[PDB]
Design a protein around this motif. Sequence first.
Motif, PDB file in Angstrom:
ATOM      1  N   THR A  47       0.902  -1.177   0.000  1.00 11.79           N
ATOM      2  CA  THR A  47       0.000   0.000   0.000  1.00 11.79           C
ATOM      3  C   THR A  47       0.921   1.201   0.000  1.00 11.79           C
ATOM      4  O   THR A  47       2.126   1.070   0.324  1.00 11.79           O
ATOM      5  CB  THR A  47      -0.917   0.084   1.245  1.00 11.79           C
ATOM      6  OG1 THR A  47      -0.141  -0.118   2.435  1.00 11.79           O
ATOM      7  CG2 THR A  47      -2.043  -0.951   1.205  1.00 11.79           C
ATOM      8  N   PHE A  49       0.616   3.642   2.087  1.00 13.63           N
ATOM      9  CA  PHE A  49       0.839   3.920   3.483  1.00 13.63           C
ATOM     10  C   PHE A  49       2.026   3.111   4.066  1.00 13.63           C
ATOM     11  O   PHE A  49       2.839   3.613   4.852  1.00 13.63           O
ATOM     12  CB  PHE A  49      -0.425   3.676   4.308  1.00 13.63           C
ATOM     13  CG  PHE A  49      -0.231   4.004   5.763  1.00 13.63           C
ATOM     14  CD1 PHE A  49      -0.128   5.339   6.185  1.00 13.63           C
ATOM     15  CD2 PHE A  49      -0.079   2.979   6.714  1.00 13.63           C
ATOM     16  CE1 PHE A  49       0.103   5.631   7.518  1.00 13.63           C
ATOM     17  CE2 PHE A  49       0.150   3.278   8.040  1.00 13.63           C
ATOM     18  CZ  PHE A  49       0.243   4.602   8.446  1.00 13.63           C
ATOM     19  N   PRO A  77       7.207  -1.502 -10.396  1.00 11.90           N
ATOM     20  CA  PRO A  77       5.966  -0.763 -10.245  1.00 11.90           C
ATOM     21  C   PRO A  77       5.495  -0.940  -8.827  1.00 11.90           C
ATOM     22  O   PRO A  77       6.156  -1.594  -8.006  1.00 11.90           O
ATOM     23  CB  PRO A  77       5.024  -1.432 -11.224  1.00 11.90           C
ATOM     24  CG  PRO A  77       5.477  -2.829 -11.139  1.00 11.90           C
ATOM     25  CD  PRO A  77       6.944  -2.878 -10.830  1.00 11.90           C
ATOM     26  N   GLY A  78       4.380  -0.366  -8.462  1.00  9.49           N
ATOM     27  CA  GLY A  78       3.918  -0.749  -7.166  1.00  9.49           C
ATOM     28  C   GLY A  78       3.031   0.255  -6.538  1.00  9.49           C
ATOM     29  O   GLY A  78       2.943   1.333  -7.040  1.00  9.49           O
ATOM     30  N   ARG A  81       6.272   3.655  -3.987  1.00 13.43           N
ATOM     31  CA  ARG A  81       7.128   4.536  -4.777  1.00 13.43           C
ATOM     32  C   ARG A  81       6.797   6.007  -4.849  1.00 13.43           C
ATOM     33  O   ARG A  81       7.623   6.819  -4.431  1.00 13.43           O
ATOM     34  CB  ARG A  81       7.458   3.931  -6.165  1.00 13.43           C
ATOM     35  CG  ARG A  81       6.355   3.729  -7.219  1.00 13.43           C
ATOM     36  CD  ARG A  81       6.187   4.896  -8.181  1.00 13.43           C
ATOM     37  NE  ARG A  81       7.311   5.003  -9.158  1.00 13.43           N
ATOM     38  CZ  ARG A  81       7.474   4.276 -10.273  1.00 13.43           C
ATOM     39  NH1 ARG A  81       6.598   3.361 -10.562  1.00 13.43           N
ATOM     40  NH2 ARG A  81       8.547   4.436 -11.064  1.00 13.43           N
ATOM     41  N   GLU A  82       5.556   6.351  -5.159  1.00 10.75           N
ATOM     42  CA  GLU A  82       5.180   7.753  -5.277  1.00 10.75           C
ATOM     43  C   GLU A  82       5.110   8.358  -3.863  1.00 10.75           C
ATOM     44  O   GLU A  82       5.923   9.268  -3.541  1.00 10.75           O
ATOM     45  CB  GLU A  82       3.863   7.900  -6.007  1.00 10.75           C
ATOM     46  CG  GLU A  82       3.433   9.365  -6.178  1.00 10.75           C
ATOM     47  CD  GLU A  82       2.334   9.605  -7.239  1.00 10.75           C
ATOM     48  OE1 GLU A  82       1.425   8.740  -7.372  1.00 10.75           O
ATOM     49  OE2 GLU A  82       2.373  10.667  -7.944  1.00 10.75           O
ATOM     50  N   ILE A  85       8.613   8.760  -2.013  1.00 11.23           N
ATOM     51  CA  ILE A  85       9.510   9.893  -2.130  1.00 11.23           C
ATOM     52  C   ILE A  85       8.906  11.068  -1.347  1.00 11.23           C
ATOM     53  O   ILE A  85       9.665  11.905  -0.832  1.00 11.23           O
ATOM     54  CB  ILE A  85       9.836  10.267  -3.588  1.00 11.23           C
ATOM     55  CG1 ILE A  85       8.632  10.868  -4.313  1.00 11.23           C
ATOM     56  CG2 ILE A  85      10.326   9.054  -4.345  1.00 11.23           C
ATOM     57  CD1 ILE A  85       8.971  11.247  -5.745  1.00 11.23           C
ATOM     58  N   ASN A  89      10.831  13.802   1.522  1.00 15.88           N
ATOM     59  CA  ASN A  89      10.838  15.248   1.777  1.00 15.88           C
ATOM     60  C   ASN A  89       9.856  15.653   2.830  1.00 15.88           C
ATOM     61  O   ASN A  89       9.607  16.842   2.974  1.00 15.88           O
ATOM     62  CB  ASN A  89      10.754  16.137   0.519  1.00 15.88           C
ATOM     63  CG  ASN A  89       9.443  16.006  -0.269  1.00 15.88           C
ATOM     64  OD1 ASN A  89       8.482  15.386   0.185  1.00 15.88           O
ATOM     65  ND2 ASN A  89       9.398  16.620  -1.476  1.00 15.88           N
ATOM     66  N   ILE A  98      15.278  12.503  -9.077  1.00 16.98           N
ATOM     67  CA  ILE A  98      14.364  11.386  -9.026  1.00 16.98           C
ATOM     68  C   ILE A  98      14.498  10.638 -10.343  1.00 16.98           C
ATOM     69  O   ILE A  98      13.813  10.965 -11.296  1.00 16.98           O
ATOM     70  CB  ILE A  98      12.907  11.834  -8.777  1.00 16.98           C
ATOM     71  CG1 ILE A  98      12.841  12.905  -7.677  1.00 16.98           C
ATOM     72  CG2 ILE A  98      12.041  10.629  -8.408  1.00 16.98           C
ATOM     73  CD1 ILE A  98      11.423  13.420  -7.516  1.00 16.98           C
ATOM     74  N   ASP A 100      13.989   6.954 -12.431  1.00 16.70           N
ATOM     75  CA  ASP A 100      13.299   5.665 -12.430  1.00 16.70           C
ATOM     76  C   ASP A 100      14.125   4.637 -13.168  1.00 16.70           C
ATOM     77  O   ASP A 100      14.234   4.689 -14.376  1.00 16.70           O
ATOM     78  CB  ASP A 100      11.931   5.779 -13.090  1.00 16.70           C
ATOM     79  CG  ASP A 100      11.161   4.450 -13.134  1.00 16.70           C
ATOM     80  OD1 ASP A 100      10.660   3.978 -12.084  1.00 16.70           O
ATOM     81  OD2 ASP A 100      11.056   3.909 -14.255  1.00 16.70           O
TER      82      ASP A 100
END
Lengths: 117, 144, 51
Positions: A47, A49, A77-78, A81-82, A85, A89, A98, A100
């Motif tokens: 997830t 989270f 993928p997954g 990841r988003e 990152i 920060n 960044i 890939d």
Amino acid sequence: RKQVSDGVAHIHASFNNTIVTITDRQGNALGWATAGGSGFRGSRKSTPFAAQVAAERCADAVKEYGIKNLEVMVKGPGPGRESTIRALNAAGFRITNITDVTPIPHNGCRPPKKRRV
Amino acid sequence: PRRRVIGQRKILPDPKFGSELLAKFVNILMVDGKKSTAESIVYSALETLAQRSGKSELEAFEVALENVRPTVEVSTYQVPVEVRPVRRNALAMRWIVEAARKRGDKSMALRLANELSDAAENKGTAVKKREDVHRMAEANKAFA
Amino acid sequence: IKVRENEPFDVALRRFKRSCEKAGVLAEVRRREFYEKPTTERKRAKASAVK
RNA sequence: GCUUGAGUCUCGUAGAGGGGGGUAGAAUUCCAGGUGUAGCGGUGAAAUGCGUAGAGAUCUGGAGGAAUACCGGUGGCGAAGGCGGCCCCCUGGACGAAGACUGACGCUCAGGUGCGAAAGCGUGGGGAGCAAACAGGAUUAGAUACCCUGGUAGUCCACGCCGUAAACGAUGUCGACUUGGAGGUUGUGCCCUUGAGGCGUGGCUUCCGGAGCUAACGCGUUAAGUCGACCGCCUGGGGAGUACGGCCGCAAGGUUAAAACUCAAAUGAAUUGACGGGGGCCCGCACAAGCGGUGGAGCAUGUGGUUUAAUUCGAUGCAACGCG
């Protein structure tokens, strides 16, 4: 300890688990944290989270190095990841690059059969 | 609710304090259409609550109910979702009343006065229901 | 791929990932070598792209 | 004899056509080493599996095999099977432009011969990934399956065999004629090019449609229209593409190919409905949100059963069971 001051956050998001490894620019790992090692075994370790708390927990455990700048390298993928990152920060890091770095074959090996579910 | 979005009906406020909040509390407590009995229980219990805590009537009630309001509540997924304010204090009152029916004191005014007093320093049963709901929505935080 | 840190930025918001790799190219190479289903998947993809 | 069929020559064009040789870059696996530490992997969920003998992640170096992302396209080439990095060598065909030459040299083709995916077989290599068999874990009533973790033959190379496929446009080959539209791809001529030009003429190909045909569905100048030439094949379903015999094959099997018996249907296309663990939209105390019950106790009443001399008859999923 050893006071590296710049590193790389290799995040390895797969479909089942995200695994964040903070290293230096030479490629020597300084400390890692997986989504499956942060509680929530199973359907909950894949997830955004779980990936963000994995990244929060990997931002801890590299306090001994004084990392301020880091590149981010993203594999796979997954659901992670988003968000991953983002957590970086949210942990005071100056996120510089960044990239890939998902491995794409140029029609190499034959992928497995599967999944008549 | 399939089609029909609805309004809501307006309840008369409390005949002693003018509080529609406490009026809905005597409706949550009421059984078998006996409203006089339930408002007697609420006046006695909150009267001894105001005498015990020494604050006042409905701010002792509002504190004791402020400690039991849920924040968020929960293939089969148990997702956490943010509770609406009317549902928030509706659940608060339902848990206070239900936990007060669970207690083993003499009269209902003592069961509910002791339950609101145990919720004023948030150590009663309805606060364990709120902490239980918040453990469910805190464990399953991974779904939003 | 790579995006250098800007002098005054909070979020890089790189779209480099979207224009190429993530959505299609890796989910495609998870499963079987056919020769057969792609000829018909491309046949009905180009037969669906019609007015 | 003749050139309008067929063929030869000149000049170009496009192409994953074929065979041989070389090389390149990503990626997977393995091996050796550095950092580093508690999980990794997997699933609907799990477990088997891998992991403090240090995995997974990460960086460096190496080995090896297979396949060649993007270009990539109802794009191209090939008789069909089929052919996809880049480069060289050997080589087949097609198409176009003008001109020359031969002069009916043509079309089809039973037997015959050749080529013929994949799996399989033989000998010798190779073996990274994937994966029949197999093993374990799950799921399940069972699970010799689907799912998971491993995994051998095989897939790859050389030479030989096999000889088949939903080998399919389920449409034999060759030729002629018969309204159109939009594209794609590859030639080329002409004309202010004075654009993202205009106007023509060929080759191959995609979609839609007219007449016509068709049981209908659809085909529709690439015909399933209108004709001609030659070939192949069909004659109710099953038994049966099976048995016996022959030929072929190392084998697996391939090919040629019946009968007894049995049924009165089997079949195609389309229509109406119903159904779907198909799709879209919509409703109802249907679910959800709640409140109070039933199932537990005693009694009332009805029923099934049992008993009885009789326990009158009827009602029995919902829509019979204080019902007549």
